[PDB]
Design an enzyme around this catalytic site. Structure first.
Site, PDB file in Angstrom:
ATOM      1  CE  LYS E   4      -1.477  -2.085   3.511  1.00 46.59           C
ATOM      2  NZ  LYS E   4      -1.922  -2.286   4.915  1.00 46.59           N
ATOM      3  CD  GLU E  30       0.918   2.414   8.566  1.00 49.07           C
ATOM      4  OE1 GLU E  30       2.047   1.921   8.355  1.00 49.07           O
ATOM      5  OE2 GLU E  30      -0.085   1.718   8.828  1.00 49.07           O
ATOM      6  NE  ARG E  31       6.925  -0.418   8.750  1.00 43.59           N
ATOM      7  CZ  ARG E  31       5.930  -0.760   7.930  1.00 43.59           C
ATOM      8  NH1 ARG E  31       5.268   0.159   7.233  1.00 43.59           N
ATOM      9  NH2 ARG E  31       5.585  -2.038   7.814  1.00 43.59           N
TER      10      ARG E  31
HETATM   11  N1  LIG Z   1       5.361  -2.436  -6.791  1.00 47.37           N
HETATM   12  C1  LIG Z   1       6.138  -3.291  -6.083  1.00 47.37           C
HETATM   13  N2  LIG Z   1       7.131  -3.996  -6.677  1.00 47.37           N
HETATM   14  C2  LIG Z   1       7.916  -4.854  -5.990  1.00 47.37           C
HETATM   15  N3  LIG Z   1       7.774  -5.076  -4.666  1.00 47.37           N
HETATM   16  C3  LIG Z   1       6.819  -4.439  -3.944  1.00 47.37           C
HETATM   17  C4  LIG Z   1       5.928  -3.490  -4.629  1.00 47.37           C
HETATM   18  N4  LIG Z   1       5.089  -3.008  -3.698  1.00 47.37           N
HETATM   19  C5  LIG Z   1       5.409  -3.592  -2.515  1.00 47.37           C
HETATM   20  N5  LIG Z   1       6.439  -4.447  -2.662  1.00 47.37           N
HETATM   21  C6  LIG Z   1       7.059  -5.259  -1.581  1.00 47.37           C
HETATM   22  O1  LIG Z   1       6.228  -5.276  -0.413  1.00 47.37           O
HETATM   23  C7  LIG Z   1       6.964  -4.846   0.738  1.00 47.37           C
HETATM   24  C8  LIG Z   1       6.100  -4.013   1.681  1.00 47.37           C
HETATM   25  O2  LIG Z   1       5.486  -2.919   1.004  1.00 47.37           O
HETATM   26  P1  LIG Z   1       4.608  -1.859   1.839  1.00 47.37           P
HETATM   27  O3  LIG Z   1       4.033  -0.842   0.885  1.00 47.37           O
HETATM   28  O4  LIG Z   1       5.432  -1.400   3.017  1.00 47.37           O
HETATM   29  O5  LIG Z   1       3.395  -2.775   2.371  1.00 47.37           O
HETATM   30  P2  LIG Z   1       2.390  -2.286   3.532  1.00 47.37           P
HETATM   31  O6  LIG Z   1       1.947  -0.903   3.118  1.00 47.37           O
HETATM   32  O7  LIG Z   1       1.305  -3.334   3.493  1.00 47.37           O
HETATM   33  O8  LIG Z   1       3.230  -2.316   4.786  1.00 47.37           O
HETATM   34  C9  LIG Z   1       8.178  -4.093   0.217  1.00 47.37           C
HETATM   35  O9  LIG Z   1       9.320  -4.300   1.053  1.00 47.37           O
HETATM   36  C10 LIG Z   1       8.393  -4.646  -1.177  1.00 47.37           C
HETATM   37  O10 LIG Z   1       9.410  -5.653  -1.185  1.00 47.37           O
HETATM   38 MG   LIG Z   2       2.283   0.526   4.775  1.00 47.82          MG
END
Ligand SMILES: Nc1ncnc2c1ncn2[C@@H]1O[C@H](COP(=O)(O)OP(=O)(O)O)[C@@H](O)[C@H]1O
Ligand SMILES: [Mg+2]
Ligand SMILES: Nc1ncnc2c1ncn2[C@@H]1O[C@H](COP(=O)(O)OP(=O)(O)OP(=O)(O)O)[C@@H](O)[C@H]1O
Ligand SMILES: Nc1ncnc2c1ncn2[C@@H]1O[C@H](COP(=O)(O)OP(=O)(O)OP(=O)(O)O)[C@@H](O)[C@H]1O
Ligand SMILES: Nc1ncnc2c1ncn2[C@@H]1O[C@H](COP(=O)(O)OP(=O)(O)O)[C@@H](O)[C@H]1O
Ligand SMILES: [Mg+2]
Ligand SMILES: [Mg+2]
Ligand SMILES: [Mg+2]
Lengths: 479, 469, 53, 41, 316, 128, 255, 160
Positions: E4, E30-31
């Site tokens: 997300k 969030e973080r």
């Molecule tokens: N478009 C993308 N391409 C490749 N990997 C992705 C992509 N989006 C997310 N990821 C993977 O998902 C992990 C977590 O993404 P994040 O946005 O932090 O998820 P959330 O918002 O659910 O915590 C990242 O470390 C990455 O490796």
């Molecule tokens: Mg997130």
């Protein structure tokens, strides 16, 4: 300060005013606070009165003076509400001045008993090919529109409302049907686009809109369906016919729950109150067909239910299914495929084989009902007649938004599919076929459509005339 | 004695007295009302106060409002004057035909017949339905249950039994509308006038009517079952005659209890139900029975939430029934009507000594091949029909015909189906399945057995299909 | 052709039973998670009901 | 227990009922031809 | 951890830079380091200028380190900043919330202490109304306009959970991110048989856009229906009609995947920004059967259809 | 202490699963409204405020750091459970270990597909 | 009604056979005098029919002069309807079984406290035979409905509820009841009390809360399936799952 | 059907024979019938002796016929007997618990009767602490040790 008629607030929080005094107040009676907001005394206890606030309760402080209206909660009813967007209490909210009503009806009146009712005779045309042919709705009936989020639940209600124009523009008074849309927990942007869609189709002039959105408090969302039902009863009793759409009863139950739990009433199944069945039953039972002695009119109800992940076996859905006469399941599988509206023909039913379809539709729909049933078994050697015919008919059941068809127009498009003028044609081309075919018949062959309405059936002359139209249209369509 | 209303929360109402404190189950007349409003005493809270339940809407009630004790429980009209007349929970008529000029009265609450009053006569009751009479036949005097989910066909099945049994039955009958659609009550009322069961112009009616539909509050729907059976108790005890007690739906009685159990002060039990679900059903059900004096043949429709037979409401009811008819949705969606489950419908009279060895062997023979048919269906899913042996192909061929031969078009459901209604005799039913299991109609197609009367019409329908093909 | 067809059936049915066993193991764990969730959820309804009194 | 495949109502259940209906649609046509020839001759 | 924050950063990278009006970010529960990452990244790009008074973004933060009362009201704080530009000035605002679940999550914590009877799954009884009053403010009025991209957390991958379930009604377009799709390698892991939109209509987008869109969702639905048969029996027992349906579906699944500009640091591949008109032409060709001869992995992680064919030419 | 005084430190919570059940005990004895798996509403807030304190300080604030390695126990490899997903949404990456790989002797058993660390990738040697 | 079960010393391993007169039971799942054998299964599987046939079979021994081989039966009807018990008592009267059979009846019409006590009342009657060198059989039909009665009683007393709304000590309810059924050694009379508890499983679910408790208490169990019933296997005793650990030793060498 | 009691008696014998340590059998919440079966099998084998003082086992029974308050504290009673031989006599003790599930069940029943709001799957809030305070006492020390062989009934065959 008279403790009998007026009273002071002890505690207020989350829209629940505990009021000291009000010794002469009735159960379910409206009350006015010092700020101007209105309420409703539900819990009568020895030491206090549990009042729920209609609207924002943040103006109400401790020790405020709670007055009495001296009457059970009621809303205005009449023909002045037609073309007006109103709230749960019946106040205008569209900037078109005050309502000119000269009558008021209670929100929680009992439904007509056994004697006033009579078997459902008259037809309620939704203007949808899949509905009117397979799952016909009669006047004074409860037909559930159950389905998941974003599956065209509301789309059925709008097409039904826009379909009433042809009846209301006509001279016949008893053929009319005044609509009453009720929004429960929907955002205002969704309702704003909805009323405009009705305004653009010239549908508002015979329709009422009871808006109880998410910004509005829980008591208003709880009350809104009952207020709209009372407005429908005005027509029901006084000769005319009416339609009402509860959109939706799922979000009402959430509002009713919130209100109940804050009144310190114990939680039940899934935290809902014990009488959530009673909530929807007394609302829906009021929808009925009145006999000629009492009036002759009726109130048709189209309640909506949102199912989580296609779970029709959930608590609130199973309650509403048992209440209503018939139900229309909208599955997500058919939706994503392209089959819109996504009405599951197998599961969806309507408990009424009366004069709802009329004699014209009964002939063509009866044969379509069997062939689709034959198809659905095979779908999951020289026997491609059943498999092909079913796929061709399923494509005809598709229908674009805001384009409700007349009963005579629906017979024409089915006649081509049933008699086998789409068998050799490609499945993907049926959408373009019907678009051009429907536009052609409406443009020129008005006498043919008119004679089907006059005779009320497909005559031998009209059958022979239809044969010449579809056969020539097919050859022209193909290369 | 007089009491004042001290609290009102929904259907529950608290009434305080100064001296003459009324017992439990007593009817309390609320003064200063347009319509009559009876409150039944449930609990004694203490300090000369009692917690009651309202038999009608509680809107309008005020704290400090006068309430008179009747003295006795909710008493209602009983006798032949109740026949051909619709009445409330509390006994008032609602068919626009003036007051009911009854001679005797009877309280809706009463002790159940004792162990010494129980009968053991198990005589078969031929309904005319092929699935019932063969597999789970009803007994004359016994208790009959019609289990089924939403829209599987309970109401159509019970009206078919009213059509077949009540007309042939010479004695009186009683129909109890409990928490169901008032539209159905309207249709049932006018239908019995057309057929000539309820008579308006003269007093020759054979059906009493009690109605408490889903528009009514919790207290009303929880007590109409008692109000209904109380009318049948008169035709059992006082008049030495056989009685029929149709109920639809008995789930709504147990449901109605849970709608006010939280407000009465009970801790909620499993699946949201009241903790008194077994006892409240027990005291009610045990009254509906064939005593040594009279005989009530009850037919209760039982709603099963989400087709879940493990649900407490239907699960507890199984113990109270002599014969059961469990309707399935899976069978209904195939087109088989009535959608009765042949492998989930039992009866006490299903015994070689009671109904003969020819009845027992054929009935069990149908259940054997239908059970084996399910085991093969699992193998068919992977293999297919063509790969199976001749012995297994023959089992499926006969089973599918037996499944469809169980189906039958009702007279009440002519408008739904389109076909004419049928009514197969007992010996015609037994002979029909006997010939199919023996293998005398292997050459005929399965479509001919679908929706027909006796075995003769299956052969007659095969001729029509042969000519068309 | 028979010996080649018989050996392929043996191998195909072996993979079918092994792949089915893999799905049963996944569904067994999913069943046990949902089993515990229903027990925990339905109990919280009862405690909430008792606490409200 | 037995009959668990069709009770689930999945891909295998729908393909199973479709297989049965196909087979008996063929056997229905064969048997109707048998009744034709028996009726005529 | 489905994607997300990566998705919302991409949308800010794509849309917020190419935009006339202002933007508003709201870090709800969030973080905190992500706020630091975002803050310095926006100073680096130039959207937040320290010297000049020409900043295009307004930052608001009440992160997961803060107490519940802060996290319960910070969503309203950042909301009020965006409302000023809408009402008084009349500007097209781009609102960004991450994560809106933390507003509702914070509500449940205080609800317990406020002396209320708990609702289903331990949530507050005022879940709909608290979200309603908050969400209804985020909308386009007659004078101004607000475009809100709200990140929504899903407890235990359960969409039926009250918090996300209630949010669905307050959205014009949804984007459901599946874990199963992410674990396969398809990024962004947007579920094509779950994500929906209200503007997706032949009257608005066009019949070509619509018919192609539902054609993709049809073949993916047909592919999902055959998964049980493939798992047990195999691909060999399927008919030739089914084999073609599966082959194209797998290629369509992979062509949905796309390399992101924000994910250049993580993955290594260069980001791609596919135009609207070229998107429809790509899937339309695959549905008709113009690239059946090509392999599947050629469609995996590419921009337009041209680069998918170019990637297949590289393989030999 | 180290973080604030320009020094780098590591901390290992072994484990936060056993902390969660301890805090659940306290909350259930406090008679607070339970939710998923009988856990209270603030079990996320419990671990969030703890882990957030692990951070990298700039030169202005000493230039120190605090690195956190929280441990979580999953039941039958259910990473989609309530407590794991909460800690996954707090931390800057995961290291998932499988019973399958560990049983075969592949130790340390690390699932390369599920395990990620994008933040730590930037802080890596060019040689590696 | 409330008495503690025999301790460690008074008991002894089960030796004398308890003949049901059913081939499937007596051969494959043999029961002994003093043993606790569960009769578990779905509704309409023939649970009560196993119990009734066992009572009728004792006429052979009770008509004889050998006192050691006699057996006095006890049927405890819990939450049934009176017309069913009336039919049941008639059947025992017709077979000339009532002369050695006590019938405790707490029907559905009766208050919950009576259904709660009925097993303990019936047990105490059976204990009299055990403590006088005689042998007794007791059938709790059924313990499922007792738990519902005990639940109603505890819930209305405002006692804290547990799993599936049953009270905390719902396991203790059936445990102290069944433990009282035992085989006494010669020094403590030499008699015995044999229990045949009955449980109603919902949809064949043996891992449900109340069934799991009673299965873990008893020395064995006799599972009855609906599938086996309609196929032709009557009684529908699933041999694979049904077992009797204690009664294998208490069996004639001929069998 | 797998020689469970024979294995138990051998571990008692072999530990007493080799390491010179006595044993303890805590009968927690199982069948009193089974307690009678084991008692006489131990006399038959010789690990218990009624004639002279050469017995190797100290039995501590609290079966399912006793209340939940008793059943919850039986393991602690048997544990305390084992703690003597460790702390006072300096032996390598062998403590059997048959079975540990019933100790957990009794703790759940006692917690329920007190009116504490239950945890996940109907278990007590104090599940980890009740187990922890008992299992931590079973350890090696400077003076001796207590090794414990605990029977386990996994409910619904579910390890989670
Ligand atoms: N478009 C993308 N391409 C490749 N990997 C992705 C992509 N989006 C997310 N990821 C993977 O998902 C992990 C977590 O993404 P994040 O946005 O932090 O998820 P959330 O918002 O659910 O915590 C990242 O470390 C990455 O490796
Ligand atoms: Mg997130
Ligand atoms: N027949 C149709 N043809 C084309 N598009 C359709 C059709 N029916 C519905 N849609 C599209 O699907 C979208 C969702 O429909 P709709 O809002 O009526 O369903 P809903 O169940 O009421 O959803 P919600 O209640 O969540 O708003 C609409 O925005 C519309 O564009
Ligand atoms: N060995 C048998 N042979 C033939 N029929 C049998 C046999 N055992 C039982 N039945 C029949 O099965 C039916 C159910 O028997 P029974 O009442 O004992 O089962 P149940 O599980 O106790 O029923 P419920 O639980 O509803 O009381 C009866 O009608 C009986 O005649
Ligand atoms: N005997 C029957 N023949 C044909 N259809 C039936 C029959 N019984 C029920 N149905 C179908 O079911 C519907 C009526 O079900 P109903 O009796 O109302 O069930 P319930 O009372 O359980 O809701 C009708 O629409 C009809 O199509
Ligand atoms: Mg909608
Ligand atoms: Mg019905
Ligand atoms: Mg029985």
């Amino acid at each position: 300060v008279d403790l009998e008629e007026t009273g002071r607030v002890l505690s207020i929080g989350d829209g629940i005013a505990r009021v000291h005094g009000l010794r002469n107040v009735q159960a379910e009676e409206m009350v006015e606070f010092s700020s101007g907001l209105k309420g409703m005394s539900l819990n009568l206890e020895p030491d206090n009165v549990g009042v729920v606030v209609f609207g924002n309760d943040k103006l109400i402080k401790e020790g405020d003076i709670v007055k009495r209206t001296g009457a059970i909660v009621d809303v205005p009813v009449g023909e002045e509400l037609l073309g007006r967007v109103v709230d749960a209490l019946g106040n205008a909210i569209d900037g078109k001045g005050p309502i000119g009503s000269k009558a008021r009806r209670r929100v929680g009146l009992k439904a007509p008993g056994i004697i006033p009712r009579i078997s459902v005779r008259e037809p309620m045309q939704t203007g949808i090919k899949a509905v009117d042919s397979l799952v016909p709705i009669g006047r004074g009936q409860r037909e559930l529109i159950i389905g998941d989020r974003q599956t065209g639940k509301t789309s059925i209600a709008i097409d039904t409302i826009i379909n009433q124009k042809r009846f209301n523009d006509g001279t016949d008074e008893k053929k009319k049907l005044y609509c009453i849309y009720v929004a429960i927990g929907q955002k205002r942007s969704t309702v704003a686009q909805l009323v405009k869609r009705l305004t653009d189709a010239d549908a508002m002039k015979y329709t009422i809109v009871v808006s109880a959105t998410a910004s509005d408090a829980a008591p208003l969302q709880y009350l809104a369906p009952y207020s709209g039902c009372s407005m429908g009863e005005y027509f029901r009793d006084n000769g005319k016919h009416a339609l009402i759409i509860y959109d939706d009863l799922s979000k009402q139950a959430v509002a009713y729950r919130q209100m109940s739990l804050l009144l310190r009433r114990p939680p039940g199944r899934e935290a809902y109150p014990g009488d959530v069945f009673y909530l929807h039953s007394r609302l829906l039972e009021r929808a009925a067909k009145m006999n000629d002695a009492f009036g002759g009119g009726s109130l048709t109800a189209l309640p909506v239910i949102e199912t989580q992940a296609g779970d029709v076996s959930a608590y609130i859905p199973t309650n509403v299914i048992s209440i209503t006469d018939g139900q229309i399941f909208l599955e997500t599988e058919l939706f994503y495929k392209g089959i819109r509206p996504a009405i599951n023909v197998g599961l969806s039913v309507s408990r009424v084989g009366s004069a709802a379809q009329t004699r014209a539709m009964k002939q063509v729909a009866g044969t379509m009902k069997l062939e689709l049933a034959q198809y659905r078994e095979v779908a999951a050697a020289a026997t491609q007649q059943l498999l092909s015919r079913g796929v061709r008919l399923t494509e005809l059941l598709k229908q674009g938004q805001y384009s409700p068809m007349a009963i005579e127009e629906q017979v024409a498009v089915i006649y081509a599919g049933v008699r086998g003028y789409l068998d050799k044609l490609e499945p993907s081309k049926i959408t373009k076929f019907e678009n051009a075919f429907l536009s052609h018949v409406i443009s020129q062959h008005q006498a043919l459509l008119g004679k089907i309405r006059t005779d009320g059936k497909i005559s031998e002359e009209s059958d022979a005339k239809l044969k010449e139209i579809v056969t020539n249209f097919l050859a022209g369509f193909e290369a | 004695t007089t009491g004042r209303i001290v609290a009102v929360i929904g259907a529950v109402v608290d009434v305080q007295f100064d001296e003459g404190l009324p017992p439990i189950l007593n009817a309390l007349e609320v003064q200063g009302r347009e319509t009559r409003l009876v409150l039944e005493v449930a609990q004694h809270l203490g300090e000369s106060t009692v917690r009651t339940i309202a038999m009608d809407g509680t809107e309008g009630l005020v704290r400090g409002q006068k309430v008179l004790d009747s003295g006795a429980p909710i008493r209602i009209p009983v006798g032949p004057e109740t026949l051909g007349r619709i009445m409330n929970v509390i006994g008032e008529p609602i068919d626009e035909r003036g007051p009911i000029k009854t001679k005797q009265f009877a309280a809706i609450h009463a002790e159940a017949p004792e162990f010494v009053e129980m009968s053991v006569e198990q005589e078969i009751l031929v309904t005319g339905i092929k699935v019932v009479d063969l597999l789970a036949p009803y007994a004359k005097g016994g208790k009959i249950g019609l289990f089924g989910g939403a829209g599987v066909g309970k109401t159509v099945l019970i009206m078919e039994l009213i059509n077949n049994v009540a007309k042939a039955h010479g004695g009186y009958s009683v129909f109890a509308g409990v928490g169901e659609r008032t539209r159905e009550g309207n249709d049932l009322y006018h239908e019995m006038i057309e057929s000539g069961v309820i008579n308006l112009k003269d007093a020759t009616s054979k059906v009493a009517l009690v109605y408490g539909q889903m528009n009514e509050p919790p207290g009303a729907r929880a007590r109409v079952a008692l109000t209904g059976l109380t009318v049948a108790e008169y035709f059992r005890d006082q008049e030495g005659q056989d009685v029929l007690l149709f109920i639809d739906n008995i789930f709504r009685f147990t449901q109605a209890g849970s709608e006010v159990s939280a407000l009465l002060g009970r801790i909620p039990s499993a699946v949201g139900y009241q903790p008194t679900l077994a006892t409240d059903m027990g005291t009610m059900q045990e009254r509906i029975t064939t005593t040594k004096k009279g005989s009530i043949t009850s037919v209760q429709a039982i709603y099963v939430p989400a087709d879940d037979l493990t649900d407490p409401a239907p699960a507890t009811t199984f113990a109270h029934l002599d014969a059961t008819t469990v309707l399935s949705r899976a069978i209904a969606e195939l087109g088989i009507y009535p959608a009765v489950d042949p492998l989930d419908s039992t009866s006490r009279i299903m015994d070689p000594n009671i109904v003969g060895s020819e009845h027992y062997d054929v009935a069990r023979g149908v259940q054997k091949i239908l059970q084996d048919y399910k085991s093969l269906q699992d193998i068919i899913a992977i293999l297919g029909m063509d790969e199976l042996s001749e012995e297994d192909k023959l089992t499926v061929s006969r089973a599918r015909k037996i499944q469809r031969f169980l189906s039958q078009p009702f007279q009440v459901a002519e408008v739904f189906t389109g076909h004419l209604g049928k009514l197969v005799p007992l010996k015609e039913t037994i002979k029909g399945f006997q010939q199919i299991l023996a293998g005398e109609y292997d050459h005929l197609p399965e479509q001919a057995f679908y929706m027909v009367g006796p075995i003769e019409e299956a052969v007659a329908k095969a001729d029509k299909l042969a000519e068309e093909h | 052709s028979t010996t080649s067809e018989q050996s392929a059936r043996m191998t195909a049915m072996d993979n079918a039973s092994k792949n089915a066993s893999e799905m049963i193991d996944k569904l067994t764990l999913t069943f046990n998670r949902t089993r515990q969730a229903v027990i925990t959820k339905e109990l919280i309804e009862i405690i909430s009901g008792a606490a409200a009194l | 227990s037995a009959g668990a495949v069709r009770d689930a109502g999945g891909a295998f259940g729908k393909r199973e009922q479709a297989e049965e209906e196909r087979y008996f649609r063929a056997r229905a046509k064969e048997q109707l031809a048998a009744l034709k020839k028996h009726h005529e001759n």
